[PDB]
Structure formats: C-alpha cells, structure tokens
Amino acid sequence: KIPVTGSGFVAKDDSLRTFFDAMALQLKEPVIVSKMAARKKITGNFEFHDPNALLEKLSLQLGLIWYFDGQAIYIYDASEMRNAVVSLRNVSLNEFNNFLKRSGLYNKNYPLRGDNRKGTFYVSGPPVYVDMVVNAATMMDKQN
C-alpha cells in the first residue's frame, strides 16, 4: 500500500519539528529545535543520503543556525543569535583554544575573534554555544 521503491520522506505541510526528527536517524543524534524556529513549515519530497550537507544547505535557504555538541543537534533561528565580550585575567586565548580542540567543542563555523595571546576576545553564535564558552572561560580564571 506504500508507493515507489526509492528512499525518501514525503512532507505534506509539516512544521519543522516533525520534519527534523525524520532526519534524526540518518543523523545518529537526536535533534532539538527551538520554539521560534518551529513555526515555519515545509512541503516537498526529500531524500537523506548525507544529512550534514543537507542541513547546511537548508539552514541557509530557510534561515537557521545549528550546533552539534557531540550528543545532540541544537537548531535555533537567526533572530536568537547572541554575542558577548569577555576578558580573561589569568589565562590566554591559545591555552583556551587548546581546551576547545582537546575537548571537541571547537566549531569552525563560529570561531573566537581576538588577539592570539591576550585576555580579551569576542564570541558569537547560538545561545548554547555562547552560554558554554562564557561560563567555561570564567570558571578557568577562578581556578588559576
């Protein structure tokens, strides 16, 4: 009773929450979509065979930002991007980028802007990335 024998997801007016969980098995992590980015809708015949490029193309065509932290894929809309400026007292930026490289939380799409061996820099991105980098850079100065 089911149609043509290819592979794909047919979307008849879904609402971006029931759509990305269908991609949540080809991506091997669960997907968490925010409330402001769950009001848009999509309709069409889609086909997932490599989803990390499909999410990159749809995040630019629909207008979205996303972050994969190793255990889930958070998805926000572009009007939720926050930024902050934080100054480090007792540790440098390269000794903080080695913590991000060794921990696997480093993201090349939203890097850290600042002088290479100083205390002040500039972050911007999704709120789960900014709330992680601010608190993980403040809690290292109270160690040192």
Next chain:
Amino acid sequence: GSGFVAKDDSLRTFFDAMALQLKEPVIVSKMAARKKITGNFEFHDPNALLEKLSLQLGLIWYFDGQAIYIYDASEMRNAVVSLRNVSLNEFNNFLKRSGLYNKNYPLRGDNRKGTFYVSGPPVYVDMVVNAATMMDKQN
C-alpha cells in the same frame, strides 16, 4: 542563472533569499522589517547589491565574520569613551589583528590620546565600548 521574483515581501523573507549567495545568515531587526519590496532581482554580485540597496532604501549593515546584521538608519548610536592607560593606536591594532575593523565606520580621534569618537550599528558600538573598558581593567 538565478534570481528572485519578489511580490510584496517584507524585507525579512527577502534578505534570507539572498542569504545563499551571501554565505552567512542575516539578522534584520524588526524596525527595519516593516518596509516592503517588490520586483525581479538578479543575484550575480551580492556584496555590491547589498551596498546599493542599503543606500537606496536607507539602511545600515555590518559583517563581523559570522553573520550579517541589518538595521534601519534611525537606529545608529554613537559614543565617546576614554582609555586611561592604553593608546588608540594600540587598540586599533587589536581590532586590525582580530578582524572587527570596519573601514566604513572608523574611530575618530587623535592618534596618540585616550579619547575618541565612535559611531555605527548598535552591535558594533556595544562591542567597541565593552572591549575598551575591558582593556582598561586589565592594565
């Protein structure tokens, strides 16, 4: 080739359609989201199309390396801030080494002093003031 046939869009669904040729997401404020546009647009040189439409409609924009912020012209704010123990030529080399240097809205002031005058978009002013008062506290 490509393009976009706009029919009574609202400047938030338009600059998102431009956000594929531009390789960054675009965050247009909600005071610049009430103006509307229509017409057949062709995207073959987008960084100059955004520069032309910002002057014909009256808009200000800024690209910090991760996204493109877009405000309306009546939201531009300005400030004057004093550095107690750091020169302007050193802070401007910090901005040149970071990547936040915008030649459209530079820093007006004397070359070896502590006072200058800055003006532009609210995400650029509130970054320069906070990164200047966080460089007087370190010294």
Next chain:
Amino acid sequence: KIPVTGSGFVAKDDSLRTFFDAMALQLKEPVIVSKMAARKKITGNFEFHDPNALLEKLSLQLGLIWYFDGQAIYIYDASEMRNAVVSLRNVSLNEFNNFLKRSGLYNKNYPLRGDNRKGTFYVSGPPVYVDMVVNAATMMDKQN
C-alpha cells in the same frame, strides 16, 4: 513604464524622510532625519548633481540644521538647537580645537566661541554635536 528622458526625482507630497533617502545615493552616506523635522512636506521636480551644495540651500529655505560626522548625515529642524557653556580647569581651547581639527569633527559653520587661552567657552549647534563636545570636554579634565 516610467517615461521621462532625463534624470531626477519627482516628489508628490513627500514627507521629508522619503525625500532625503532618495538623496542618500548621490550623497554617499545614510541620512538620519529627526522626528520633529519629518512633519514637513515638499513636492516638485528635483535633481541632484552636487548635493552637498543643494542641502545647504534647502536647509535655509525650509529651515533646518545639518551635521556630517564622517559616517552619516543628521538633519534636525531649527527649533532643536541647544546651547552649552563649560569650564576647563587644566587644558586650553586652542588645545581642544587641535583635537577637533586633527580628528575631523571640526565644523566651520558652528565654531567654538571663547577666549583663546582659558578654560571657558560657548558651544552651540545640532543636538548630536553639542553632547559630543561637552562629553569630550568633561572627559579630558578627568584624564589629566
């Protein structure tokens, strides 16, 4: 669809914000018109070929004050001009005028009125010019 041979702007009951934004391409800077100066209207056939000379003449026929600070052009009406008088305990007026001339905010239509070697002067002009001159004057005595 728009048959006229030459180049120019035709305004039918324009309300001084849509009129100056059309001049904001011949002028290469964005124009910011105030709230009280946007209730006046203008209609007629205009053309722009040296708008820095056209803006001075229309700011006297309509009654306006304008200021260009290197990034934008601010336009207020005539009844919003404000005045100030400030005292400098340890720098001169000729020292402050070298800061304004060297930086690039010195305006020869609204000069600074005061004695050449004192601490007191008298400044008057547009509301974005006065609150900058006062704020830099009270931010150089506390620095020195």
Next chain:
Amino acid sequence: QRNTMSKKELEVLSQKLRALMPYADSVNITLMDDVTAAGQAEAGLKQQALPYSRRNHKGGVTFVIQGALDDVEILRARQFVDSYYRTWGGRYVQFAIELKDDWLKGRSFQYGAEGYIKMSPGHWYFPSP
C-alpha cells in the same frame, strides 16, 4: 531592393496579370524605394507628436504606440493610420496601438539610470527594463 526579377520575367508577370483582369488593357508596373516607404511613415508620425517605438528588422518594420494616450491622440492616430493604409497598404510597415494605464499618477518615483517607484511610504517597486 527585395526582388531580382529580370526584364522578361517582369513582362511575363504583366502578361499573366493582364489575363486576370479582363476589363484592363495593360497593367503598368512601377518599382519604388523601400526606404521612403518607412521614411514617410516616421516623418508623419513625428509631426503629430505621438509617443512611439520603432523596431527595424528584415522584411518589414513595425511601430509600437504605447502609453496612456488621451482623447485627441487616439483621434489623430486613426486619422493618420487610415490615410496611410489607403496609400501604401499593410504589407511592409504595421502599426500596433496599445493603450495602458499609468501607475505614476499619485506616486513619487526616481527616473534615469536606477529608476524606482515608491508605491507607498513603506513600499518600493523596482521595474526591469
């Protein structure tokens, strides 16, 4: 300037056209310039002060009369077209009178190189020419 028949080939055309009209005695064939046929149509179209556009191509020309014409301009256009069609016929040059409505009645617009029409204080229209 469009046919290359000889003298004999024009005489056999006259003798095969005389057989078609039994009342006539002899058909006289004259050759006219192709340039003055489209020159008198433009010299008469400029004298009446009508907006027009000429599209030259091979094997005939065409004139397009567009715009929101008023009442006396569509009386002079018919008085000129029906007096030109009697003289020359519609095999070479053809007029195309189409009238539309004006968008820019109460609107403010910028003309010239980068033209646009502000349909409203918060609405821009960018036409593609």
Next chain:
Amino acid sequence: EDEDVTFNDISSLSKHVDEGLDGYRDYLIKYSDRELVQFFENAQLKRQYGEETETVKRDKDEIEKPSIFALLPAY
C-alpha cells in the same frame, strides 16, 4: 528578567523599554479602530504646539507608530 537590561547609554536604555513594549503595542494596533486612533493625534498636537500643526492622514500607517497614551482611549 534578562540579566542585560542595564545598558551603558541613556538613549539605548530608553530604546529598550520601547522594544519591550512593542508586543503589547501592536496588539493595540490590530484591534483598535483606524480613524478613532487617528483622531487623537490631531487632537493632541493642536493642544501641544497650536493650531498651526498640519493634520496627519491615513498614510502614516505603513511606517509610523502612535503613542501608547493615544491608543487605549480609542481602543
């Protein structure tokens, strides 16, 4: 309840309460009458400056927002 309510400039801090109040204000715009709202700005301006202020028409609606104290009577 945002921890960054406090700004560093006097006009941006007054801008913040406007963009906080905009979600209530456009609700007043959607459900109030057109001309009854339009009557109060003309009635308040001639009190404000005098009779010489020229009247505003319907065509403001595309760009300009009224005050919060001229809405809720006509609402």
